[PDB]
Design a protein around this ligand. Structure first.
Ligand SMILES: O=C(O)c1c[nH]c2ccccc12
Lengths: 269, 268
């Protein structure tokens, strides 16, 4: 991988592996989400930021501050086949004191065609107290020099799906998958559950008949609270809709505390 | 990746990714096992065999025959760090009518040093009846031309750890992790549980204190029966000692054995 000529974005190529594909012999959305994370991490390393998933600056480390994902939105037009080369370009932009946004564009390396796009909202949090906070001026100037100054959006459209509010699923859910637990492979280097695991857990409550006859086109996921290594999760889904749409909710198995909410849009094969 | 000059082995380089490493910022044994599978798959493709993980020849496809793993043995001297380039060389050898063996050597790309080695035993099975069978002459000649004719072993040493018999853990287990279930990410393209998932399930019953103070050096795993997509597994472990453990994976309900294994851990 490498930073582009202007040094304001990063590009990297990946060859889709045998264990990364599903029943269609094309990459799963969890494989895509992992590659998005990998290219984000290589971009942060290329400009001197922390490499640990928190992308911290020198001032953030002293203050015990970290970047945490608040929302992930992914749209796939074509999933790359096993053996195909996919090129991913990523960039970061500040959204004032609210937080930062990381965007991605996925392309077929051979044709140069846009096969997918993604956007994510990140917020600053003290890693010990878990208290959210606005971005200060001192932290901001340290990373403004690595972001384009004019707006660059993966989802430029006026009322795009990436900014829609997600409602809370009401009991009873139409479908559910209960008692989901992370194993060591689901953890990152800091022993926290990897953000992509939650995508997998959301998708667990989609009936196999939908997965066999449809392809996932769009997924929007809000992250409200973290699943601890010793927590148990219930995944709930209700159909809201040729296209099929669903509302999703992940909550702790016991007390029903919300950890994530989301929506998915599926097109008939 | 590419077949080597003599066309009897295959080599491929991998850069260790951020999500592939554990608490030590080095690749997990599950990441290693996935890369071994990937290089095996690229070797089969390079010589015209099936894609799907079953590495079938033309005659096997007509007879509904597949290759299935019976045992996996991996020894790691150094886990590659995040961002490091690891080179993996793989080759196959027939073991008469018993089945086939696939071996691997892992190296640090910069130093050229051997950082790990692995071996696996594969048996032929009818995909529909799941009945094991010896390898016929007709199936054999089709793949003998892709194997070295003189023996080439990743574990040459006499009485090496890759061929030791594994006993059955007796109840009560010292440690356990119950109710383990696969999710869609644990499945391969054929909707079968990926062989590497069983390694993760075995390791789930190792106490976190061992994982924090030791590094996994050797793992030997026997595959007896497959976990279906709707099955539930219990992972059992007992200390037999460096620290050594005996492992057992069995179905949560009736206690049917799916795997047995052993692990050897070195103090950090
Ligand atoms: O798939 C098989 O049966 C194979 C036996 N020897 C090999 C060498 C390379 C790739 C696949 C095989």
């Amino acid at each position: 991988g490498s930073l582009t000529e202007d040094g304001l974005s990063y590009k990297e190529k990946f060859v889709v592996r045998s264990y990364e594909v599903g029943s269609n012999k094309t990459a799963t959305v969890e494989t895509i989400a992992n590659l998005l994370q990998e290219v984000g991490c290589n971009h942060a390393q290329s400009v001197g930021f922390s490499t640990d998933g928190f992308a911290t600056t020198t001032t953030m480390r002293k203050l015990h501050l970290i970047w945490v994902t608040a929302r992930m939105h992914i749209e796939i037009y074509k999933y790359p086949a096993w053996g195909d080369v996919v090129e991913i370009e990523t960039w970061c932009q500040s959204e004032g004191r609210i937080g930062t946004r990381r965007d991605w564009i996925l392309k077929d390396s051979v044709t140069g065609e846009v096969t997918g796009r993604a956007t994510s909202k990140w917020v600053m949090m003290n890693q010990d107290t878990r208290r959210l906070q606005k971005v200060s001026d001192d932290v901001r100037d340290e990373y403004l020099v690595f972001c384009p100054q004019e707006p660059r959006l993966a989802f430029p459209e006026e009322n795009n799906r990436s900014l829609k509010k997600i409602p809370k699923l009401e009991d009873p859910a139409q479908y559910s998958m209960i008692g989901l637990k992370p194993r060591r492979a689901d953890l990152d280097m800091n022993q926290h559950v990897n953000n992509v695991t939650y995508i997998g857990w959301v998708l667990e409550s989609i009936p196999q008949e939908i997965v066999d006859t449809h392809e996932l086109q769009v997924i929007t996921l809000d992250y409200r609270r973290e699943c601890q290594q010793d927590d148990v999760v219930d995944s709930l889904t209700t159909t809201t809709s040729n296209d099929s749409q669903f509302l999703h909710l992940l909550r702790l198995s016991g007390d029903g505390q919300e950890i994530n909410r989301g929506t998915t849009l599926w097109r008939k094969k």
